[PDB]
Amino acid sequence: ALLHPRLADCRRLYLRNHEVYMNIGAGEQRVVINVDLFVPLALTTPVEDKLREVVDYDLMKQSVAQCVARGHIHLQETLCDAIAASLLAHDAVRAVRVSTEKPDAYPDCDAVGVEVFRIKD
Amino acid sequence: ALLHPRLADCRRLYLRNHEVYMNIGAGEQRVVINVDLFVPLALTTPVEDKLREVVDYDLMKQSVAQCVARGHIHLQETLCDAIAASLLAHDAVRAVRVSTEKPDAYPDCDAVGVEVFRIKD
Amino acid sequence: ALLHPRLADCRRLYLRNHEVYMNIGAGEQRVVINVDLFVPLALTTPVEDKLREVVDYDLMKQSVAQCVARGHIHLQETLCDAIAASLLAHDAVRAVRVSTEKPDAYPDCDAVGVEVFRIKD
Amino acid sequence: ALLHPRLADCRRLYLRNHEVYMNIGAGEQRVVINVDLFVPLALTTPVEDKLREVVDYDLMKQSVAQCVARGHIHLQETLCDAIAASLLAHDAVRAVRVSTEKPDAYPDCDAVGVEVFRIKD
Ligand SMILES: Nc1nc2[nH]cnc2c(=O)[nH]1
Ligand SMILES: Nc1nc2[nH]cnc2c(=O)[nH]1
Ligand SMILES: Nc1nc2[nH]cnc2c(=O)[nH]1
Ligand SMILES: Nc1nc2[nH]cnc2c(=O)[nH]1
């Protein structure tokens, strides 16, 4: 992904397998979320080892929490697209990849999920 | 994959590690199947959180079941290619990736498998 | 990988985590090998579900066995390169990816390994 | 990655899940590090099975140890960028991918991390 020409000047921040329990469905279900945020090196290269010099990666879990807390989600696309739109709404974000999946959708499958990858023009 | 130019306007629906037991071989054997379906955002962006607004991802498991139920499969290519052809036969599908594998083909390997990735022109 | 332009008309045959025990080192050690073979669809699309219609994927494990059986291997590159050269030496092979790794090289790492990816011109 | 045009003439050396314990934070924490080093085939193709013919892959763990041993690291970017700069500082290295992650950053996530991928011009 960091080989893509629009992303070659970026670092990747990533959140792996963030689980939440929520009401979702077209009791609560487990949903597993993965996020990749692409932020420019020129905006996120610390030279004083200070948090203010980078994009705080706590924004990924915060954005998922905000989206899940809105309630009333039926489709995985609704949640996935909302997390991606939230995370794109930041000046220092160039691109985002978000997947959601339901490990318990089917007894004979590990998961079924939805993924988007959005890059700013 | 969603960086590929023909897929940049798509979301990815995915089915991870769908296991089936079937007669296959050039008793039943376990076969593990993975599917990625690429569907255009323009056709699958819900604005009312309704299932009719998207491509129902149950189509992946349904298509595998239909193919496995035909019986008389000897080669992994026969099954893999049939699942891919079935899933391409939908107006809102742009591309599909399908892999099949046999975890028990060899005692000293985790799996041997076959994968195809087909994109509509 | 099947999005690469030279590989778009290929299927991928794969062998996941083939373990062998052998003398290797610059008692026996465990080495884990992964192989991807890219073969043209035009040469490997069965229409009669017969093995003669495809490239038999047993060739991957056979080639690893032949290379390991030669003995006297010190470097991972020597083994990896030999497996790749063996598997390229077939008319219906367009490309091969081979990795070798040593899970026990270091107590505080899962593995250290070497990978090559060779495509015929 | 070995399909990328600048890397097509390279092999990949890789270190998977190197764990360290260190003080890091914007007691010690566990940090998991992954490294991919791209080195030209023309510089690393052994024909006599001798270590002097290749880039010794012990350099990856050595460089991580040197960086961790400097102490006083607050941000993951500081560590990740330092490992990448160290490993690029070798004539036979064409590119490097380095990720760091903290498995224990959040109770409901497997990890949060940072990755860079640097290629020499
Ligand atoms: N695409 C899609 N299909 C479904 N089928 C059942 N639930 C869903 C969902 O959330 N999204
Ligand atoms: N390519 C291929 N080789 C095999 N060798 C044994 N079974 C098979 C199969 O299903 N496909
Ligand atoms: N590149 C490389 N470095 C090593 N250092 C120790 N063993 C090896 C090996 O097999 N290959
Ligand atoms: N990007 C980034 N955000 C953080 N938030 C808390 N620690 C860190 C860190 O090391 N890097």
Coordinates of C-alpha atoms and ligand atoms in Angstrom, one line a residue:
Chain A
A1 CA 0.0 0.0 0.0
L2 CA 2.8 2.4 0.8
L3 CA 4.1 1.7 -2.7
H4 CA 1.0 3.3 -4.3
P5 CA 2.2 6.6 -5.8
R6 CA -0.3 8.8 -3.9
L7 CA 0.8 7.2 -0.6
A8 CA 4.6 7.0 -1.2
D9 CA 5.2 10.1 0.9
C10 CA 3.0 8.7 3.7
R11 CA 3.3 6.6 6.8
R12 CA 0.6 4.1 7.8
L13 CA -1.0 4.1 11.2
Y14 CA -3.0 1.0 11.9
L15 CA -5.5 -0.5 14.3
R16 CA -5.7 -4.2 14.2
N17 CA -8.8 -6.2 15.2
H18 CA -10.7 -3.7 17.3
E19 CA -13.7 -5.6 18.6
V20 CA -17.0 -4.0 19.6
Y21 CA -20.3 -5.4 20.6
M22 CA -23.3 -3.6 19.1
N23 CA -26.8 -4.1 17.7
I24 CA -26.3 -4.6 14.0
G25 CA -28.3 -6.6 11.5
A26 CA -30.4 -6.2 8.4
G27 CA -28.8 -9.5 21.4
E28 CA -25.7 -7.6 20.6
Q29 CA -23.3 -9.0 18.0
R30 CA -19.5 -8.9 17.9
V31 CA -18.0 -6.8 15.1
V32 CA -14.3 -6.7 14.3
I33 CA -12.9 -3.5 12.8
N34 CA -9.5 -2.8 11.1
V35 CA -8.3 0.7 10.2
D36 CA -5.3 2.0 8.2
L37 CA -4.8 5.7 8.2
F38 CA -2.2 7.2 5.6
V39 CA -0.7 10.5 6.9
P40 CA 2.1 12.4 5.1
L41 CA 5.6 12.0 6.5
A42 CA 6.1 15.8 6.0
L43 CA 3.3 16.3 8.6
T44 CA 4.2 13.5 11.0
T45 CA 8.0 13.2 11.3
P46 CA 9.0 13.9 14.9
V47 CA 12.3 15.6 15.5
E48 CA 11.7 16.2 19.2
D49 CA 9.8 13.0 20.0
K50 CA 6.7 15.0 20.9
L51 CA 3.1 13.9 20.4
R52 CA 2.2 17.3 18.9
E53 CA 4.5 16.5 16.0
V54 CA 2.4 13.6 14.8
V55 CA -1.2 12.5 14.0
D56 CA -2.3 10.9 17.3
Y57 CA -3.3 7.4 16.4
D58 CA -6.0 7.3 19.2
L59 CA -8.1 9.0 16.6
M60 CA -8.9 5.6 15.0
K61 CA -10.4 4.0 18.1
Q62 CA -12.2 7.3 18.9
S63 CA -13.8 7.5 15.5
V64 CA -15.0 3.9 15.7
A65 CA -16.5 4.6 19.2
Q66 CA -18.3 7.7 18.0
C67 CA -19.8 5.8 15.0
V68 CA -20.9 2.8 17.0
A69 CA -22.4 5.0 19.7
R70 CA -24.8 6.6 17.2
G71 CA -26.9 3.4 17.4
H72 CA -29.4 2.2 14.8
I73 CA -27.0 0.6 12.4
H74 CA -28.4 -2.3 10.2
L75 CA -25.8 -2.8 7.4
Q76 CA -22.1 -3.3 7.7
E77 CA -21.7 -0.7 4.8
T78 CA -23.4 1.9 7.0
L79 CA -20.8 1.5 9.8
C80 CA -17.8 1.0 7.5
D81 CA -18.6 4.0 5.4
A82 CA -19.3 6.2 8.5
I83 CA -15.9 5.3 10.1
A84 CA -14.1 6.0 6.8
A85 CA -15.9 9.4 6.3
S86 CA -15.1 10.4 9.9
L87 CA -11.4 9.6 9.6
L88 CA -11.0 11.3 6.2
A89 CA -12.3 14.5 7.8
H90 CA -8.9 15.6 9.0
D91 CA -6.4 17.8 7.2
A92 CA -3.4 15.5 7.8
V93 CA -5.2 12.3 6.5
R94 CA -4.4 11.4 2.9
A95 CA -6.3 8.1 2.8
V96 CA -8.1 5.5 4.9
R97 CA -8.8 1.8 4.6
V98 CA -11.6 0.5 6.9
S99 CA -13.0 -3.0 7.2
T100 CA -15.8 -4.3 9.4
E101 CA -16.6 -8.0 9.8
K102 CA -19.0 -10.3 11.6
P103 CA -17.2 -13.4 13.0
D104 CA -20.5 -15.0 13.9
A105 CA -22.5 -14.4 10.7
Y106 CA -22.2 -18.1 9.7
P107 CA -21.3 -21.2 11.7
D108 CA -19.0 -22.5 8.9
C109 CA -17.1 -19.3 8.1
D110 CA -14.5 -17.3 10.1
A111 CA -16.1 -14.0 9.0
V112 CA -18.0 -12.0 6.4
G113 CA -17.1 -8.4 6.0
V114 CA -17.0 -5.2 4.0
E115 CA -13.9 -3.0 3.2
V116 CA -13.5 0.4 1.7
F117 CA -10.3 2.3 0.7
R118 CA -10.6 6.0 0.1
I119 CA -7.8 8.3 -1.1
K120 CA -8.1 12.1 -1.3
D121 CA -7.6 13.5 -4.8
Chain B
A1 CA -6.6 -4.6 -4.2
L2 CA -8.9 -1.5 -3.9
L3 CA -5.9 0.5 -5.2
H4 CA -6.1 -1.2 -8.6
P5 CA -7.5 1.4 -11.0
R6 CA -10.5 -0.7 -12.2
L7 CA -11.4 -1.3 -8.5
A8 CA -10.8 2.2 -7.1
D9 CA -14.5 3.0 -7.3
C10 CA -15.5 -0.3 -5.6
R11 CA -16.0 -1.7 -2.1
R12 CA -14.8 -5.2 -1.2
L13 CA -17.2 -7.8 0.3
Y14 CA -15.3 -10.8 1.7
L15 CA -16.0 -14.3 3.0
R16 CA -13.1 -15.6 5.1
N17 CA -12.4 -19.3 5.5
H18 CA -15.7 -20.9 4.5
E19 CA -15.2 -24.6 5.2
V20 CA -17.1 -27.3 3.4
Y21 CA -16.8 -31.1 3.4
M22 CA -17.2 -32.7 0.0
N23 CA -16.0 -35.5 -2.2
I24 CA -13.1 -34.0 -4.2
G25 CA -9.9 -35.6 -5.5
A26 CA -8.1 -36.3 -8.8
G27 CA -14.5 -40.2 2.5
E28 CA -15.3 -36.5 2.3
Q29 CA -12.4 -34.0 2.5
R30 CA -12.4 -30.6 4.1
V31 CA -12.0 -27.7 1.6
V32 CA -11.5 -24.1 2.8
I33 CA -12.8 -21.3 0.4
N34 CA -12.1 -17.6 0.5
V35 CA -14.0 -15.1 -1.7
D36 CA -13.6 -11.3 -2.4
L37 CA -16.4 -9.6 -4.4
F38 CA -15.7 -6.1 -5.8
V39 CA -18.9 -4.1 -6.2
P40 CA -19.1 -0.4 -7.3
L41 CA -19.7 2.2 -4.5
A42 CA -22.2 3.9 -6.8
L43 CA -24.3 0.8 -6.7
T44 CA -23.9 -0.1 -3.0
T45 CA -23.8 3.1 -0.9
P46 CA -26.7 3.0 1.5
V47 CA -28.2 6.3 2.4
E48 CA -31.3 4.8 4.2
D49 CA -29.5 1.8 5.8
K50 CA -31.6 -0.7 3.8
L51 CA -30.5 -4.0 2.4
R52 CA -32.1 -3.3 -1.0
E53 CA -29.5 -0.5 -1.4
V54 CA -26.5 -2.9 -1.4
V55 CA -25.3 -6.2 -2.9
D56 CA -26.3 -8.8 -0.3
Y57 CA -23.1 -10.5 0.8
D58 CA -25.0 -13.8 1.4
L59 CA -24.5 -14.3 -2.3
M60 CA -21.0 -15.5 -1.7
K61 CA -21.9 -18.4 0.7
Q62 CA -24.9 -19.2 -1.6
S63 CA -22.8 -19.5 -4.7
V64 CA -20.3 -21.8 -2.9
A65 CA -23.1 -24.0 -1.7
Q66 CA -24.7 -24.2 -5.2
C67 CA -21.3 -25.2 -6.7
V68 CA -20.5 -27.8 -4.1
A69 CA -24.0 -29.3 -4.3
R70 CA -23.5 -30.2 -8.0
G71 CA -21.2 -33.1 -6.9
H72 CA -18.7 -34.9 -9.1
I73 CA -15.8 -32.4 -8.6
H74 CA -12.3 -33.9 -9.0
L75 CA -10.0 -30.9 -9.4
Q76 CA -9.7 -27.7 -7.2
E77 CA -9.7 -25.7 -10.5
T78 CA -13.1 -27.1 -11.4
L79 CA -14.6 -25.8 -8.1
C80 CA -12.7 -22.6 -8.0
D81 CA -13.5 -21.6 -11.5
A82 CA -17.2 -22.5 -11.1
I83 CA -17.5 -20.3 -8.0
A84 CA -15.8 -17.4 -9.7
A85 CA -18.1 -17.8 -12.8
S86 CA -21.2 -17.9 -10.7
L87 CA -20.3 -14.8 -8.7
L88 CA -19.3 -12.8 -11.9
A89 CA -22.8 -13.5 -13.3
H90 CA -24.3 -10.4 -11.5
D91 CA -24.7 -6.9 -12.9
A92 CA -23.3 -5.2 -9.8
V93 CA -20.2 -7.4 -9.6
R94 CA -17.0 -5.8 -11.1
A95 CA -14.5 -8.5 -10.1
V96 CA -14.1 -11.6 -7.9
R97 CA -11.2 -13.3 -6.2
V98 CA -11.8 -17.0 -5.2
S99 CA -9.4 -19.4 -3.6
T100 CA -10.0 -23.1 -2.7
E101 CA -7.5 -25.1 -0.6
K102 CA -7.2 -28.5 1.0
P103 CA -5.7 -28.3 4.5
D104 CA -5.2 -32.1 4.5
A105 CA -3.5 -32.7 1.2
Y106 CA -0.1 -33.2 2.8
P107 CA 0.8 -34.1 6.4
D108 CA 3.8 -31.6 6.4
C109 CA 2.0 -28.6 4.8
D110 CA -0.8 -26.3 6.1
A111 CA -2.6 -26.3 2.7
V112 CA -2.4 -26.5 -1.0
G113 CA -4.7 -24.4 -3.1
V114 CA -5.8 -22.6 -6.2
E115 CA -6.8 -19.0 -6.7
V116 CA -8.3 -16.9 -9.5
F117 CA -8.9 -13.2 -9.8
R118 CA -11.2 -12.1 -12.6
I119 CA -12.1 -8.5 -13.5
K120 CA -14.8 -7.5 -16.0
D121 CA -13.5 -5.4 -18.9
Chain C
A1 CA -0.5 -10.5 -7.3
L2 CA -3.0 -11.7 -9.9
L3 CA -3.6 -7.9 -10.7
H4 CA 0.0 -7.6 -12.0
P5 CA -0.3 -7.2 -15.8
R6 CA 2.0 -10.1 -16.6
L7 CA -0.1 -12.4 -14.3
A8 CA -3.6 -11.2 -15.1
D9 CA -4.1 -14.2 -17.4
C10 CA -2.8 -16.6 -14.8
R11 CA -4.2 -18.7 -11.9
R12 CA -2.1 -19.0 -8.7
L13 CA -1.3 -22.4 -7.2
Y14 CA 0.0 -22.2 -3.7
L15 CA 1.6 -24.3 -1.0
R16 CA 1.3 -22.8 2.5
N17 CA 3.8 -23.5 5.3
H18 CA 5.5 -26.6 4.0
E19 CA 7.8 -27.6 6.9
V20 CA 11.0 -29.6 6.5
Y21 CA 13.8 -30.5 8.8
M22 CA 17.3 -30.3 7.4
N23 CA 20.9 -29.3 8.1
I24 CA 21.2 -25.6 7.2
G25 CA 23.3 -22.9 8.7
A26 CA 26.1 -20.5 7.8
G27 CA 21.2 -31.1 14.7
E28 CA 18.6 -30.5 12.0
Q29 CA 16.7 -27.3 12.0
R30 CA 13.0 -26.6 11.0
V31 CA 12.6 -24.6 7.8
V32 CA 9.2 -23.4 6.7
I33 CA 8.7 -22.9 2.9
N34 CA 5.9 -21.1 1.0
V35 CA 5.4 -21.3 -2.8
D36 CA 3.2 -19.5 -5.3
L37 CA 3.2 -20.8 -8.9
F38 CA 1.6 -18.6 -11.6
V39 CA 0.3 -20.7 -14.5
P40 CA -1.7 -19.4 -17.5
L41 CA -5.5 -19.9 -17.5
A42 CA -5.2 -20.8 -21.2
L43 CA -3.1 -23.8 -20.2
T44 CA -4.9 -24.9 -17.0
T45 CA -8.7 -24.5 -17.5
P46 CA -10.3 -27.9 -17.2
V47 CA -13.3 -28.5 -19.2
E48 CA -13.5 -32.2 -18.5
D49 CA -12.4 -32.1 -14.9
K50 CA -9.2 -34.2 -15.7
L51 CA -5.8 -33.8 -14.1
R52 CA -4.1 -33.8 -17.5
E53 CA -5.8 -30.5 -18.3
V54 CA -3.9 -28.6 -15.5
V55 CA -0.5 -28.1 -14.0
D56 CA -0.4 -30.7 -11.1
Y57 CA 0.3 -28.7 -8.0
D58 CA 2.2 -31.7 -6.5
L59 CA 5.1 -30.2 -8.4
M60 CA 5.7 -27.6 -5.6
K61 CA 6.2 -30.1 -2.8
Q62 CA 8.2 -32.4 -5.2
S63 CA 10.6 -29.6 -6.1
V64 CA 11.2 -28.6 -2.5
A65 CA 11.9 -32.2 -1.6
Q66 CA 14.4 -32.5 -4.5
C67 CA 16.2 -29.4 -3.4
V68 CA 16.3 -30.3 0.3
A69 CA 17.6 -33.8 -0.6
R70 CA 20.7 -32.5 -2.3
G71 CA 22.2 -31.7 1.1
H72 CA 25.0 -29.4 1.9
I73 CA 22.9 -26.2 2.1
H74 CA 24.4 -23.3 4.3
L75 CA 22.4 -20.2 3.3
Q76 CA 18.6 -19.7 3.0
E77 CA 19.3 -18.0 -0.3
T78 CA 20.9 -21.2 -1.7
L79 CA 17.7 -23.2 -0.9
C80 CA 15.2 -20.5 -1.9
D81 CA 16.9 -19.7 -5.2
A82 CA 17.2 -23.4 -6.0
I83 CA 13.5 -24.1 -5.4
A84 CA 12.6 -21.0 -7.6
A85 CA 14.9 -22.1 -10.4
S86 CA 13.5 -25.7 -10.3
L87 CA 9.9 -24.5 -10.5
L88 CA 10.5 -22.0 -13.3
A89 CA 11.9 -24.8 -15.5
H90 CA 8.5 -25.8 -16.8
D91 CA 6.8 -24.5 -19.9
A92 CA 3.5 -23.8 -18.3
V93 CA 5.0 -21.7 -15.3
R94 CA 4.9 -17.9 -15.9
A95 CA 6.2 -16.9 -12.5
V96 CA 7.1 -18.2 -9.0
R97 CA 7.3 -16.7 -5.5
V98 CA 9.3 -18.8 -3.0
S99 CA 10.0 -17.9 0.6
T100 CA 12.1 -19.9 3.2
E101 CA 12.2 -19.0 6.9
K102 CA 13.7 -20.3 10.1
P103 CA 11.3 -20.1 13.0
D104 CA 14.0 -20.9 15.5
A105 CA 16.7 -18.5 14.3
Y106 CA 16.1 -16.2 17.3
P107 CA 14.3 -16.7 20.6
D108 CA 12.5 -13.3 20.5
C109 CA 11.3 -13.5 16.8
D110 CA 8.7 -15.6 15.1
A111 CA 11.0 -16.1 12.0
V112 CA 13.7 -14.8 9.7
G113 CA 13.4 -15.5 6.1
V114 CA 14.2 -14.9 2.4
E115 CA 11.8 -14.4 -0.5
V116 CA 12.2 -14.2 -4.2
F117 CA 9.6 -13.5 -7.0
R118 CA 10.7 -14.3 -10.5
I119 CA 8.6 -13.7 -13.6
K120 CA 9.5 -14.9 -17.1
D121 CA 9.9 -12.1 -19.7
Chain D
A1 CA 6.1 -5.9 -3.1
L2 CA 8.7 -7.7 -5.3
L3 CA 6.4 -6.8 -8.2
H4 CA 7.1 -3.1 -7.7
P5 CA 9.4 -2.0 -10.6
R6 CA 12.2 -0.6 -8.4
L7 CA 12.2 -3.9 -6.4
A8 CA 11.8 -6.4 -9.3
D9 CA 15.6 -7.1 -9.3
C10 CA 15.6 -7.6 -5.5
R11 CA 15.1 -10.3 -2.9
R12 CA 13.3 -9.7 0.3
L13 CA 14.9 -10.5 3.7
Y14 CA 12.3 -10.4 6.5
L15 CA 12.1 -10.5 10.3
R16 CA 8.7 -11.5 11.5
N17 CA 7.3 -10.4 15.0
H18 CA 10.5 -9.4 16.8
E19 CA 9.3 -8.6 20.3
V20 CA 11.1 -6.3 22.6
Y21 CA 10.3 -4.8 26.0
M22 CA 11.2 -1.2 26.5
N23 CA 10.0 2.1 28.0
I24 CA 7.9 3.8 25.4
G25 CA 4.9 6.1 25.7
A26 CA 3.8 9.6 25.0
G27 CA 6.9 -0.3 33.6
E28 CA 8.2 -1.6 30.3
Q29 CA 5.8 -2.3 27.5
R30 CA 5.9 -5.0 24.8
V31 CA 6.6 -3.7 21.3
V32 CA 6.4 -6.0 18.2
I33 CA 8.6 -5.1 15.2
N34 CA 8.5 -6.4 11.6
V35 CA 11.2 -5.6 9.0
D36 CA 11.5 -6.2 5.3
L37 CA 14.8 -5.4 3.7
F38 CA 15.1 -5.3 -0.2
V39 CA 18.5 -6.1 -1.5
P40 CA 19.5 -6.5 -5.2
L41 CA 19.9 -10.1 -6.5
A42 CA 23.0 -9.0 -8.3
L43 CA 24.6 -8.3 -4.9
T44 CA 23.2 -11.3 -3.0
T45 CA 23.2 -14.4 -5.3
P46 CA 25.5 -17.0 -3.8
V47 CA 27.2 -19.2 -6.2
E48 CA 29.5 -20.8 -3.5
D49 CA 27.0 -21.0 -0.7
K50 CA 29.1 -18.5 1.4
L51 CA 27.8 -15.9 3.8
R52 CA 30.2 -13.2 2.4
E53 CA 28.2 -13.5 -0.9
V54 CA 25.0 -12.1 0.7
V55 CA 23.6 -9.4 3.0
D56 CA 23.6 -11.0 6.4
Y57 CA 20.0 -10.9 7.6
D58 CA 21.2 -10.6 11.3
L59 CA 21.5 -6.9 10.5
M60 CA 17.7 -6.5 11.0
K61 CA 17.7 -7.7 14.6
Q62 CA 21.0 -5.8 15.3
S63 CA 19.6 -2.6 14.1
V64 CA 16.4 -2.9 16.2
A65 CA 18.6 -3.7 19.2
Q66 CA 20.8 -0.6 18.6
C67 CA 17.7 1.6 18.3
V68 CA 15.9 0.3 21.4
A69 CA 19.1 0.5 23.4
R70 CA 19.3 4.3 22.9
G71 CA 16.5 4.7 25.4
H72 CA 14.3 7.8 25.8
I73 CA 11.8 6.8 23.1
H74 CA 8.2 8.3 23.6
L75 CA 6.5 7.9 20.1
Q76 CA 6.3 4.8 17.9
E77 CA 7.3 7.0 15.0
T78 CA 10.6 7.8 16.7
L79 CA 11.5 4.1 17.0
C80 CA 10.1 3.1 13.6
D81 CA 11.8 5.9 11.7
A82 CA 15.1 5.3 13.5
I83 CA 15.1 1.6 12.6
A84 CA 14.3 2.4 9.0
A85 CA 17.1 5.0 8.7
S86 CA 19.6 2.7 10.3
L87 CA 18.8 -0.1 7.8
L88 CA 18.8 2.2 4.8
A89 CA 22.4 3.2 5.7
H90 CA 23.9 0.2 3.8
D91 CA 25.1 0.2 0.2
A92 CA 23.4 -3.1 -0.7
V93 CA 19.9 -2.0 0.7
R94 CA 17.5 -0.7 -1.9
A95 CA 14.5 -0.3 0.4
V96 CA 13.1 -1.1 3.8
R97 CA 9.6 -1.6 5.3
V98 CA 9.5 -1.3 9.2
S99 CA 6.5 -1.5 11.4
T100 CA 6.2 -1.2 15.2
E101 CA 3.1 -2.0 17.2
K102 CA 1.9 -2.1 20.7
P103 CA -0.2 -5.2 21.4
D104 CA -1.3 -3.8 24.8
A105 CA -2.3 -0.2 23.9
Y106 CA -6.0 -1.0 24.2
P107 CA -7.8 -3.9 25.9
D108 CA -10.3 -4.3 22.9
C109 CA -7.7 -4.2 20.1
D110 CA -5.0 -6.7 19.0
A111 CA -2.5 -3.8 18.3
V112 CA -2.0 -0.2 17.2
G113 CA 1.1 0.5 15.1
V114 CA 3.0 2.6 12.7
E115 CA 4.7 1.5 9.4
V116 CA 7.0 3.2 6.9
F117 CA 8.3 2.0 3.5
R118 CA 11.3 3.8 2.2
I119 CA 12.9 3.2 -1.3
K120 CA 16.1 4.7 -2.4
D121 CA 15.8 6.8 -5.6
Ligands
LIG1 N1 -23.8 -6.3 1.8 C1 -24.5 -6.7 2.9 N2 -25.3 -7.9 2.9 C2 -25.9 -8.3 4.0 N3 -26.6 -9.4 4.2 C3 -27.0 -9.4 5.5 N4 -26.5 -8.3 6.2 C4 -25.8 -7.6 5.3 C5 -25.0 -6.4 5.3 O1 -24.8 -5.7 6.4 N5 -24.4 -6.0 4.1
LIG2 N1 -3.6 -28.4 -10.2 C1 -4.0 -29.5 -9.5 N2 -3.1 -30.5 -9.2 C2 -3.7 -31.5 -8.4 N3 -2.9 -32.6 -8.0 C3 -3.8 -33.4 -7.3 N4 -5.1 -32.8 -7.2 C4 -4.9 -31.7 -8.0 C5 -5.9 -30.6 -8.3 O1 -7.1 -30.5 -7.9 N5 -5.4 -29.5 -9.0
LIG3 N1 21.2 -13.5 4.2 C1 21.5 -14.5 5.1 N2 22.1 -14.1 6.4 C2 22.3 -15.1 7.2 N3 22.9 -14.9 8.5 C3 23.0 -16.2 9.0 N4 22.4 -17.2 8.1 C4 22.1 -16.4 7.0 C5 21.5 -16.8 5.7 O1 21.2 -18.0 5.4 N5 21.2 -15.8 4.8
LIG4 N1 0.9 8.6 16.2 C1 1.0 8.3 17.5 N2 0.0 8.6 18.4 C2 0.1 8.2 19.7 N3 -0.8 8.3 20.7 C3 -0.2 7.8 21.8 N4 1.1 7.3 21.6 C4 1.2 7.6 20.2 C5 2.4 7.3 19.3 O1 3.5 6.8 19.7 N5 2.2 7.8 18.0

